[PDB]
Ligand binder design. Structure first.
Ligand SMILES: Nc1nc2c(ncn2[C@@H]2O[C@H](COP(=O)(O)OP(=O)(O)O)[C@@H](O)[C@H]2O)c(=O)[nH]1
Ligand SMILES: Nc1nc2c(ncn2[C@@H]2O[C@H](COP(=O)(O)OP(=O)(O)O)[C@@H](O)[C@H]2O)c(=O)[nH]1
Lengths: 157, 161
């Protein structure tokens, strides 16, 4: 099994991402992917409930084969804090997949004149880090399985 | 595209350097594509900086490993930023690459010296660059002095590897 860690600030949607991926619903865990030819099993750890414990995050990053690092496209601070998480991963570690989650609210946010992190900011930040990038919605399921497959393919190298 | 990172202490003028270079103006991650003519040929640069991330040593190192070259800035009117050049060079040499040492804000040297404030003379900048085998240049993001020239000098050394 490949050990995959979900990290990012509280309230970015880590628990929701896992439930959508594993149980297909919105309100460690095991996940079998078919990646290219092969059956590929993931063991999925998350830092939800424990985000403030740097030592726990760091320990997870040490045992990780790969990291899914979420921010929330509607929460600017969660995107600013990506630097805090990546520094911890670079020190303790591994493929990183940067995920702009909650992409489904962007239209609502935009309509009501509220600020969202544009996707190209995430693409560019991810590029500087040598990280993959993906926008997802744990709510409507969009890109959820695809983000994890893109990470798994990079881990299998 | 050659990958070029700007580094150095906060407030040395990394953003201002990039904005002057890429947009010819002075007023997420700073990230710009820039085409230069180096000798005969078109040469594409992928440029970013460590503004907002200076205190993250693991990220800095990751950036220095990924760079084809570094523009490393200090502020000629701020001695501490110059002394810290030695910390930055250690990280760059530990990580990996051509370095261009840039003494930025050269336009303020007269204002500093008029007001009794200490500045780093270019001779000291050149001497530190020679210690490390780095290129050296003084620049001003504010008035545009030597900004493109610095980058071209680095790009030539990067193409030579
Ligand atoms: N609209 C929307 N809400 C989401 C999404 N993902 C999570 N949420 C909501 O964001 C809040 C925080 O989500 P949660 O999964 O608990 O985040 P965690 O703290 O990172 O584990 C909850 O109210 C979720 O319903 C998403 O993709 N879209
Ligand atoms: N006078 C002068 N000021 C500059 C120059 N470059 C940057 N600054 C100013 O110094 C401050 C820090 O610059 P900034 O680009 O944000 O530096 P950074 O933290 O390294 O990215 C800003 O207020 C700039 O306007 C320069 O060449 N001359």
């Amino acid at each position: 099994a490949y050990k995959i860690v979900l990290a990012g600030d509280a309230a970015v949607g880590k628990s929701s991402f896992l439930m959508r991926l594993c149980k297909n619903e919105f309100r460690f865990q095991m996940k079998t992917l078919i990646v290219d030819g092969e059956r590929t099993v993931l063991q999925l750890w998350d830092t939800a409930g424990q985000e403030r414990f740097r030592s726990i995050a760091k320990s997870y990053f040490r045992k990780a084969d790969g990291v899914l690092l979420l921010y929330d496209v509607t929460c600017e601070k969660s995107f600013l804090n990506i630097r805090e998480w990546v520094d911890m991963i670079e020190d303790a570690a591994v493929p990183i997949m940067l995920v702009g989650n909650k992409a489904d609210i962007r239209d609502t946010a935009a309509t009501e004149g509220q600020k969202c992190v544009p996707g190209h900011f995430g693409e560019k930040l991810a590029m500087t880090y040598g990280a993959l990038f993906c926008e997802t919605s744990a709510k409507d399921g969009s890109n959820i399985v695809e983000a994890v497959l893109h990470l798994a393919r990079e881990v299998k190298k």
